[PDB]
Amino acid sequence: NLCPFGEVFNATKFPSVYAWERKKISNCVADYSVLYNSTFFSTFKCYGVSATKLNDLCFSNVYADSFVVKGDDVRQIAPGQTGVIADYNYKLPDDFMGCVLAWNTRNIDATSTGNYNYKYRYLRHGKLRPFERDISNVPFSPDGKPCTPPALNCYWPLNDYGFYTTTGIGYQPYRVVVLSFELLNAPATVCGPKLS
Amino acid sequence: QVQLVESGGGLVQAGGSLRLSCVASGRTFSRYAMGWFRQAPGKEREFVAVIEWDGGTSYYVDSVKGRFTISRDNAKNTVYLQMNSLKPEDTAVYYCAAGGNQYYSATYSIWNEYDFWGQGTQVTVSS
Ligand SMILES: *[C@@H]1O[C@H](CO)[C@@H](O)[C@H](O)[C@H]1NC(C)=O
Ligand SMILES: *[C@@H]1O[C@H](CO)[C@@H](O)[C@H](O)[C@H]1NC(C)=O
């Protein structure tokens, strides 16, 4: 039984970063050549693991996180990064083991008029913990005190990406998939094609 | 955040040798491919060398093949750049960089493709 990476990388719709989505990949044969033989990836890099050697490895479990970010924000999807994406939307652990893949999706995520369906959080009281997710949409106050706009000093915590088919590449939309490699003291559930 | 501190730079006569070191903080050093870049006067940061997380694969810019050799010690959180047969062309600030193990080797030579960067150590090779 092949691991369902197609369902992940080829999903018709992708979520916003702040509402990032995780699929558990487990108990299956991972044929990573599907990512080798597709040559559209503009980010493809791994931590604790050689990117080209994935078919030779077994993992306890693989987690696939999908979301969309601005081109210039892709770099925040790494261990130890700072910034509003990495501190308020999606944070990888210092000791991350896995891979980050990204590809330019101008032709399906951007528009002449501008696509504003994709959002990120930019106001928050305290940074996210690694792999933590915050999908609330609560008026934000620097007092921390609850507030009801139009009250003063009361702000909305999300903001839109505006994805236009005519901007520079750093502003165009990128679909991101993070693969987390879990290592436990047991048999492995996700192995490569000829490993058992 | 992982911090990178270079050392071993300094002043050396043409024909001589230096050995640069870069120490990372934390315990996560062995996840990363470790690179060296350099910046000569009037030039962009240029790739010099990389070694992957496990020490087994490594690449060099052509102008240093056979003179420079990169190595690492995951036990000491330290990447090394052995520099022989130095020439004035090697005069530059040498920067350590930490990033992911890349699927395309060419990506290793793009400074912006790494995750962390040192503040550099100066190397001057006098004629
Ligand atoms: C997505 O679909 C294409 C078209 O068949 C296929 O070649 C590719 O392998 C698929 N990608 C994944 C992740 O399976
Ligand atoms: C890429 O090639 C490998 C072996 O050559 C194969 O296993 C894999 O299915 C190919 N991927 C495709 C055609 O998407």
Residue numbers in the entry:
A (entry chain S): 321 to 516
B (entry chain B): 1 to 127
Any passages from the paper?
Here, we report on the identification of a special group of nanobodies from immunized alpaca with potency against diverse VOCs including Omicron subvariants BA.1, BA.2 and BA.4/5, SARS-CoV-1, and major sarbecoviruses. To search for broadly neutralizing antibodies, we decided to use immunized alpaca with RBD and spike protein of SARS-CoV-2, as this animal species, like those in the family of Camelidae, encode a small single heavy chain nanobody (<15 kDa) with one variable domain (VHH) that are able to reach regions otherwise inaccessible by conventional human antibodies. We determined crystal structures of 1-2C7, Nb70, and 3-2A2-4 bound to the recombinant RBDs.
The crystal structure of Nb70 was determined in two forms. The Nb70 epitopes were highly conserved between SARS-CoV-2 and SARS-CoV-1. These residues interacted with R31, E52, N101, Y103 and D115 of Nb70 through hydrogen bonds, salt-bridges, and van der Waals contacts. For instance, D115 formed hydrogen bonds and salt bridges with K378 and Y380 at the Nb70-SARS-CoV-2 interface and with K365, Y367, R395 and Q401 at the Nb70-SARS-CoV-1 interface. Such conserved epitopes provided a structural basis for the cross-neutralizing activity of Nb70 against SARS-CoV-2 and SARS-CoV-1. Nb70 epitope, on the other hand, was largely confined to the middle of RBD cryptic face and further away from the ACE2 binding site.
